[PDB]
Write a protein that binds this ligand. Structure first.
Ligand SMILES: [Ca+2]
Ligand SMILES: [Ca+2]
Lengths: 159, 15
């Protein structure tokens, strides 16, 4: 379901190896290496992203889920590339926005999402009205939460 | 404005 070009893979390996100690930069060693989030978050292609902390956690397959291997780094790039299908992009956006990882976007997830975006912070009343507007347009079943199909549907209607 | 919000949220993530 995901795609990579040869150029993307080759350029990604060069960028990933720059994050490694000199002794782990060979092809064989770099493919076994785990880069801590601190080094990943410093990458110019990710440093400005308001969701960078969540992006790292969603793509990590490491034992303590605190680092990225080259394989995780490529998984990340295949989703963020221009080749990724709208269905892949909305599937992973849902995982990134699900701050508690339970399968639905609730009011706290939406408030955390807004706070990531704004960093001038909204008043309690402005946040309440914005969450109410998001839920009115996205929560079809009116259960108070946004599931994956509701989310993919509202994203497919994007202005 | 739900739809406008999601456009800005997706653009902040993928743009
Ligand atoms: Ca949730
Ligand atoms: Ca729902």
């Amino acid at each position: 379901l995901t795609f990579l070009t040869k150029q993307e893979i080759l350029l990604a390996h060069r960028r990933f190896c720059e994050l490694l100690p000199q002794e782990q930069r060979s092809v064989e060693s770099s493919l076994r290496a785990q880069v801590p989030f601190e080094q990943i978050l410093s990458l110019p292609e990710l440093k400005a992203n308001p969701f960078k902390e969540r992006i790292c956690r969603v793509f990590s397959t490491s034992p303590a889920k605190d680092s990225l291997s080259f394989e995780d780094f490529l998984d990340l790039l295949s989703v963020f590339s221009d080749t990724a299908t709208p269905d892949i992009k909305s599937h992973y956006a849902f995982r990134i926005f699900d701050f508690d990882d339970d399968g639905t976007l609730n009011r706290e997830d939406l408030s955390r999402l807004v706070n990531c975006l704004t960093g001038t912070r909204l008043s309690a009343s402005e946040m309440k009205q914005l969450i109410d507007n998001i839920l009115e347009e996205s929560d079809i079943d009116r259960d108070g939460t946004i599931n994956l199909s509701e989310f993919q549907h509202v994203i497919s209607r994007s202005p | 404005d739900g739809g406008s919000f999601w456009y800005r949220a997706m653009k902040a993530l993928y743009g």
